[PDB]
C-alpha cells in the first residue's frame, strides 16, 4: 500500500535526475516572448530537442541497473524511447499552469510554427488528454523511466534484464496512483494506456520534420542519429 524505505529512496533519486532537465518556464518564455518565423521556430525547436536528447541520455544512465545492461540493448532502449520521452515532456510543459491566456497563446505559436496541421491536431489532443489526468511531477518522472525501460522494444536481445529494471518503477507508480488518487482506481491503467498512445508518434516523426514549411531542414548530428534523419 504505502511506499517502503527503498521505494521512497528510488522515487527521490528518480526525481533528482529528472529535475536536471531545462525548466518548463525556460522553454515557454522563449516562445511566448515574440512572434517568430517558421525558419526561426524550426531552429528554436531543433536546439530544444537536441538539449532534450542530451539530458535524456544522462537521466537514462542514472536509472538503477541501466549501466549493467548489454551495450547494444542500451542504444536500442534510448533510440526506441527518445521521441516518446520528448512528447511526454512536451505534454508536461504545455499543461503547466501559466497566467490567463498564456497557455492559449503558446498553443497558437506552436500551431503557426511551420508544422503541418495533420500532425498538430493529434499532438495537442494528446497534450490535452494527458492534462485531464492531472499528473504530478513524480508521475511524469516515473512514466518517463518506464517508457525508457520498455522491454517490448525493437532489437532488444535480453528482454528479461529490462523487465527486472522496469518492474520496481511500475510498482512505485502503482502505489503513488493509489495514494494521490484513491477516488479513481483506474488512474494507474490510464497512465499505462497513455504509453500505447505515445508509441503512435514514432512512425510518422521523420515525416512531420521533413514536411515542415521551411526551404531547408537543418538538424544537429545528435538529432540525425536519434531521429534517423538526413
Amino acid at each position: 500500500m504505502e511506499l517502503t524505505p527503498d521505494q521512497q529512496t528510488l522515487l527521490h533519486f528518480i526525481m533528482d535526475s529528472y529535475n536536471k532537465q531545462r525548466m518548463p518556464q525556460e522553454i515557454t518564455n522563449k516562445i511566448l516572448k515574440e512572434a517568430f518565423s517558421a525558419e526561426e521556430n524550426f531552429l528554436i525547436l531543433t536546439e530544444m530537442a537536441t538539449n532534450h536528447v542530451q539530458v535524456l541520455v544522462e537521466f537514462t544512465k542514472k536509472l538503477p541497473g541501466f549501466q549493467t545492461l548489454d551495450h547494444e540493448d542500451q542504444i536500442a532502449l534510448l533510440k526506441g524511447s527518445a521521441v516518446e520521452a520528448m512528447f511526454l515532456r512536451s505534454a508536461e510543459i504545455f499543461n503547466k499552469k501559466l497566467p490567463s491566456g498564456h497557455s492559449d497563446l503558446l498553443e497558437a505559436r506552436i500551431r503557426n510554427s511551420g508544422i503541418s496541421d495533420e500532425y498538430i491536431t493529434p499532438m495537442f489532443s494528446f497534450y490535452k488528454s494527458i492534462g485531464e489526468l492531472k499528473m504530478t511531477q513524480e508521475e511524469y518522472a516515473l512514466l518517463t523511466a518506464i517508457v525508457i525501460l520498455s522491454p517490448d522494444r525493437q532489437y532488444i536481445k535480453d528482454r528479461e534484464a529490462v523487465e527486472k529494471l522496469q518492474e520496481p518503477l511500475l510498482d512505485v507508480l502503482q502505489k503513488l496512483c493509489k495514494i494521490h488518487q484513491p477516488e479513481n482506481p483506474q488512474h494507474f491503467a490510464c497512465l499505462l494506456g497513455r504509453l500505447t498512445e505515445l508509441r503512435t508518434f514514432n512512425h510518422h516523426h521523420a515525416e512531420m520534420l521533413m514536411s515542415w514549411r521551411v526551404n531547408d531542414h537543418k538538424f544537429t548530428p545528435l538529432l540525425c542519429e536519434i531521429w534517423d534523419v538526413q
Binding site: 541520455v57 551495450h71 542500451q74 542504444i75 534510448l78 533510440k79 548530428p221 542519429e225
Partner: peptide, 11 residues
C-alpha cells in the same frame, strides 16, 4: 553506427 549515442553512454 550510432557513435554519438554510444559515446554519450560510455564517457
Amino acid at each position: 553506427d550510432h557513435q554519438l549515442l554510444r559515446y554519450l553512454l560510455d564517457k
